[PDB]
């Protein structure tokens, strides 16, 4: 059954994405002398992993790799209600296993926060929600525009375009809220490390941005 | 009406470009603890954002996202005079709102200059005009060459080719003049911050570079 193969693809795609991306953000300098946080390091690993994962699993499950976009397809009637509940559950499970494996292989002296997204100390959580609302908006709009069958002028790798959309989101909002733009990516390490601070902005934020982006494209720009 | 949708797309696309790209230029160490400036951070965020915006809005409004290229199409009779004035006004408006949002979500101690393009202290504005004239010339020439219908050897993503043209412009002239190569990108934060020093070189510069690039391609190289 392709339905079970699609769900297992989403679980496995998220598992690789979380494990590889959260590993790159590990600060090997430790707490006694933290090394400067390489910034293009985190952006490319998060960005290119999505491009790699969409290339790998795009034809098997659609390559949502995000609870935010999965909701957008339901809002735009691209997948069924029963379709999304298995995707969201599989995506959340993949992050939990993906981050759980990383905790086992990472030496305790360099684990730190395990890539858990934190809002800046001087930044209000209200502004943190707005940042997530926008960085996910450009991501979902790119995904919808790149995967439009009615278009003709689409050139190049669709997965690469989606990957670079994630990278610029990280190139902007790592110090604001961690540039989550993925509720599953924030749910995983939060479960493992037991850190649950301002976690609602990482679900309400991307979902509102996803629904706004999907509705604008499907019902206003290209109806 | 497709006219209203095209102008709205330009306002929205240009707004996202400012907020994401100017945010990457924020020095989170502040004036009192300046962190070293990451050049690939600024270059890639600016370069890939244009490549993302062209992918998102290329089929809706043409994906100018620049007052300089809009003049170039007029100089080559590719868009109407009435079309350009609404494009330029929307692009100027998008940067003003886009920079205003960034000023709202940035902590006061790290706002700094808000990405406003100053000329280097040891560099004369006369030489600064020449730098802006050239890095915009290579941008407009790439856009005209990438989007030429008569060509048959164009391969890969057109948006990515335009995106990397912007990136190399930033990799060259960030400490020369800030590598504006976009009159709207300089007008937006300047309005918000009220900094108006050598601002004419950021309008006269890119526009003259665009006119030379558009005229040379359309009337000399590939007539």
């Amino acid at each position, epitope marked *: 059954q392709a339905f079970w193969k699609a769900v297992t693809a989403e679980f496995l795609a998220m598992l690789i994405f979380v494990l590889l991306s959260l590993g790159s953000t590990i600060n090997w300098g430790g707490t006694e002398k933290p090394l400067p946080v390489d910034m293009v390091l985190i952006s490319l690993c998060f960005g290119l992993s999505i491009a790699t994962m969409v290339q790998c699993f795009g034809h098997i499950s659609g390559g949502h790799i995000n609870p935010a976009v999965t909701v957008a397809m339901v809002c735009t009637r691209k997948i069924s209600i029963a379709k999304s509940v298995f995707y969201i559950a599989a995506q959340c499970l993949g992050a939990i296993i993906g981050a759980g494996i990383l905790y086992l292989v990472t030496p305790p002296s360099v684990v730190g926060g395990l890539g858990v997204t934190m809002v800046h100390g001087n930044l209000t959580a209200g502004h943190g929600l707005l940042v997530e609302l926008i960085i996910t908006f450009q991501l979902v709009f790119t995904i919808f525009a790149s995967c439009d069958s009615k278009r003709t002028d689409v050139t190049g790798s669709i997965a690469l375009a989606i990957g670079f959309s994630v990278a610029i989101g990280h190139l902007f909002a790592i110090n604001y809220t961690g540039a989550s733009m993925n509720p599953a990516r924030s749910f995983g390490p939060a479960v493992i490390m037991g850190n649950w601070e301002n976690h609602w902005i990482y679900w309400v934020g991307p979902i509102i941005g996803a629904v706004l982006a999907g509705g604008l494209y499907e019902y206003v720009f290209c109806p | 009406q497709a006219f209203w949708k095209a102008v709205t797309a330009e306002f929205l696309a240009m707004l996202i470009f400012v907020l994401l790209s100017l945010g990457s230029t924020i020095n989170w160490g502040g004036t009192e603890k300046p962190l070293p400036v990451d050049m690939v951070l600024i270059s890639l965020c600016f370069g890939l954002s244009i490549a993302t915006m062209v992918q998102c809005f290329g089929h809706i409004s043409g994906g100018h996202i620049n007052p300089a290229v809009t003049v170039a199409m007029v100089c080559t009779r590719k868009i109407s005079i009435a079309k350009s004035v609404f494009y330029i006004a929307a692009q100027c408006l998008g940067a003003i709102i886009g920079a205003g949002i960034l000023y709202l979500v940035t*902590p006061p*101690s790290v706002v700094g200059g808000l990405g406003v393009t100053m000329v280097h202290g040891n560099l004369t504005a006369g030489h600064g005009l020449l730098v802006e004239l050239i890095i915009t010339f290579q941008l407009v020439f790439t856009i005209f060459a990438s989007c030429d219908s008569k060509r048959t050897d164009v391969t890969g993503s057109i948006a990515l080719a335009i995106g990397f043209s912007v990136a190399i412009g930033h990799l060259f002239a960030i400490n020369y003049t800030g590598a504006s190569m976009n009159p709207a990108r300089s007008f937006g934060p300047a309005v918000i911050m009220g900094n108006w020093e050598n601002h004419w070189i950021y309008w006269v510069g890119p526009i003259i570079g665009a006119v030379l690039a558009g005229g040379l391609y359309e009337y000399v190289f590939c007539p």
Partner: antibody, heavy 116, light 108 residues
């Protein structure tokens, strides 16, 4: 136009508890980190505690750990410092100062005397 | 922690003289240093941040230098207002620590 006003000082029995306030106005209180600095009579300055703009991150000096708790309320733009288990050494003049790294704006100072 | 020691403890000078005080850090803190001026019964006033930058509103006669562990604050032309107590502050890493304080006194 930026000023900080302190309150809550004065005499206090040893081993008690105290609440120090620092009312702030003229600047965006939410977006700036707040600090507590004391100066014992005849001695130098001693940094005590730090709090982020949203209160998410708080740090304390080695001698200020446990006994002192710093919290801020951005609704009324007031900074509080819970001083518990006061000792005879803990007497000093306390200043509230803003600044993540370097303090530029200081209050007038509140004198706390711990004496039976 | 990082212990910051000042030298001399107290120095004497006349109006118009040039004096320098030194702040010594236990470990390297590069250009993360701050200087303050405090008069009796008054809050400290910030003079220098980044160990070489002058805070706005401060006269240019104050000059700071040094990096790593050796820092020197120098006053070019002494003034009657300049007689106060000067502290060196560390902000490379938490906890932030001040110096032991150096007092400037009139010479007679």
């Amino acid at each position: 136009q930026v000023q900080l006003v302190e309150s809550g000082g004065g005499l206090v029995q040893p081993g008690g508890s105290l609440r120090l306030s620092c009312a702030a106005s003229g600047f965006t209180f939410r977006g700036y980190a707040m600090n507590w600095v004391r100066q014992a009579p005849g001695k130098g300055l001693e940094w005590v505690a730090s709090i982020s703009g949203s209160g998410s991150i708080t740090q304390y000096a080695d001698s200020a750990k446990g006994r002192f708790t710093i919290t801020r309320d951005n609704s009324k733009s007031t900074l509080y410092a819970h001083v518990s288990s006061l000792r005879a050494d803990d007497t000093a003049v306390y200043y509230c100062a803003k600044g993540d790294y370097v303090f530029d704006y200081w209050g007038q100072g509140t004198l706390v005397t711990v004496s039976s | 922690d990082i212990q910051m020691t000042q030298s001399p403890s107290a120095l004497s000078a006349s109006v118009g003289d040039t004096v320098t005080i030194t702040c010594r850090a236990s470990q390297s803190i590069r250009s993360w240093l701050a200087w303050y001026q405090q008069k009796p019964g008054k809050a400290p006033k910030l003079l220098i941040y980044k160990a070489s930058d002058l805070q706005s509103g401060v006269p240019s006669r104050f000059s700071g230098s040094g990096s790593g562990t050796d820092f020197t604050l120098t006053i070019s032309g002494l003034q009657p207002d300049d007689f106060a107590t000067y502290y060196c502050q560390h902000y490379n890493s938490y906890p932030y620590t001040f110096g032991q304080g150096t007092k400037v006194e009139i010479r007679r």
